[PDB]
Design an enzyme around this catalytic site. Structure first.
Site, short mmCIF file in Angstrom:
data_model
loop_
_atom_site.label_atom_id
_atom_site.label_comp_id
_atom_site.label_asym_id
_atom_site.label_seq_id
_atom_site.Cartn_x
_atom_site.Cartn_y
_atom_site.Cartn_z
N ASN A 67 9.79 29.11 17.56
CA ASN A 67 9.86 29.39 16.38
C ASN A 67 8.43 28.48 15.86
OD1 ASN A 67 12.80 27.52 16.69
ND2 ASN A 67 12.66 29.91 15.84
N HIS A 108 7.32 25.59 17.34
CA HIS A 108 7.05 24.43 16.96
C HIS A 108 6.61 24.01 18.55
CE1 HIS A 108 8.40 23.79 12.59
NE2 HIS A 108 9.10 25.15 13.29
N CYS A 159 4.87 16.76 17.17
CA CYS A 159 3.33 16.73 16.14
C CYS A 159 2.98 18.24 16.44
CB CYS A 159 2.95 17.14 18.50
SG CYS A 159 1.18 17.19 19.16
#
Ligand SMILES: CC(C)CNC(=O)c1nccn1C
Ligand SMILES: CC(C)CNC(=O)c1nccn1C
Lengths: 265, 264
Positions: free
Chosen positions: A186, A188, A223
């Site tokens: 995804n 991330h 992050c």
């Protein structure tokens, strides 16, 4: 991998790969953390999850890790088979818990254990919300009813409050950036990357002379792909203990906090 | 995994993991490169290498990758099984070649292929040496005698000369550092990390709209654990790119390569 007889837990065997081991020819803590993630995803897949429910996908709700706690007694060697058993349990409206037991496939002995706390969050607004009753019932049928804890001990290290590291840190590793291999499907940053970033500020002398026994990590903020991170460590202690802090390289915004416990080889 | 009937090649099946796939839910090129490395190590292990021979250990000699070439037709999806077959062949005193064929375990169709050139080097002085003759014979018994090439076509992409990128580069990713996960069991930077570093300078727009079909990488010098790397890319064209990895300070070359991407 397969669900156990009662269908309330999942087991999987893994052969430790050449690139998955460190200087001691045994699996790193990040390899173990990747295997826990893998067995966790295979368990959700085995019970009908593409681990969001029908209602969650509708409301744009996701499960996010808030805390991770791993204790390793013996790291598996390159070429060894490790069997991991995992299960989930609801902890009221706070969220869910996922627990793991790592075993030596040959002897059957417990070589490690882990626990994690998960909370419900809107993927778009990032706002936490308690688990609704309609969501809760959808996944209660996949969890054991009676308590089943990987960490049942009276005052166990998995639920201890983690303080914030005060500057100046004793050690630091500056300018850490994620690459595409650090991202999940995804886009991330993978939860395992933060473990590697926490450990980057431990001096090489500790790594060379000690074994990592315990690691507890709190996840405060994610992050971004274009963010830069600073990793900070201070010794708090025949055993070494460290307080850890991950923060954004610019304004010093906190992303993670944790503690590690190491024992002499 | 197991050696084939003739004992001259090795096969292994792998199930693609959740953390091993990208945005298209298919295995990344670094996951494939890790699986090739894994099947290559298991082949050396199966034929008695605990891949240095007992003579090489006495002389402090190691095998080092000089060139890597991978061509993928279909990246395996998350949860699929990929079967990889690997073998080695001597190429005279220059060194050894290791080849791989990737197949869909269900259909048996070829989904990818790879080749690599290996050279003998003293681990301490880092001086390149010819393979000699007493070392030749020790591993000739594990290779097929007749040629067996993953890239047989005369005038193929795996043997094309790679030029040096001239400044200014069109794209760049600077300040790349290895972390402990990037190191192997001997504390050297894993040769798969360099592939990821080359691809860091490709714009996200190309990654999102294209699929990587071919990658050729030359290994000139190793990046130390405390070195910082700069990754440079220029479009040379299907999309084609010229790549350069160099030390962030003095600009010392560590790698050069080319990639070929197809529209999705
Ligand atoms: C807590 C860290 C190591 C991530 N591990 C996981 O359990 C996980 N992440 C995504 C999906 N799963 C099952
Ligand atoms: C696959 C590419 C990155 C080259 N790596 C290898 O093949 C390898 N490294 C050590 C042992 N092997 C077989």
């Amino acid at each position: 991998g397969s669900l156990t007889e009662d269908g309330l837990s999942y087991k999987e065997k893994f052969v430790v790969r050449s690139y998955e081991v460190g200087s001691n020819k045994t699996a790193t803590v990040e390899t173990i953390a990747n295997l826990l993630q893998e067995v966790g995803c295979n368990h959700a897949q085995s019970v009908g999850f593409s681990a969001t429910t029908t209602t969650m996908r509708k409301l744009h709700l996701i499960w996010v890790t808030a805390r991770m706690h791993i204790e390793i007694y013996k790291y598996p060697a390159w070429g060894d088979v490790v069997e991991i058993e995992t299960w989930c349990q609801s902890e009221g409206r706070i969220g869910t818990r996922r627990d793991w037991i790592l075993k030596d496939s040959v002897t059957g002995e417990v070589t490690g254990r882990a626990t994690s706390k998960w909370v419900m969050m809107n993927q778009d607004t990032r706002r936490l919300q308690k688990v609704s009753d309609d969501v809760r019932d959808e996944y209660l049928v996949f969890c054991p009813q009676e308590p089943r804890l990987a960490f049942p001990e009276e005052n166990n290290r998995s639920l201890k409050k983690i303080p914030k590291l005060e500057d100046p840190a004793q050690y630091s590793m500056i300018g850490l950036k994620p690459r595409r291999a650090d991202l999940d499907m995804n886009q991330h940053v993978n939860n395992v990357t933060y473990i590697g970033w926490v450990l980057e500020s431990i001096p090489q002398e500790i790594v060379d002379t000690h074994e990592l026994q315990v690691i507890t990590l709190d996840y405060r903020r994610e992050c971004q792909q274009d963010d830069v991170v600073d990793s900070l460590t201070t010794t708090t202690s025949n055993d070494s203990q460290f307080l850890h802090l991950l923060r954004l390289s610019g304004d010093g915004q906190e992303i993670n906090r944790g503690t590690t416990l190491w024992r002499k080889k």
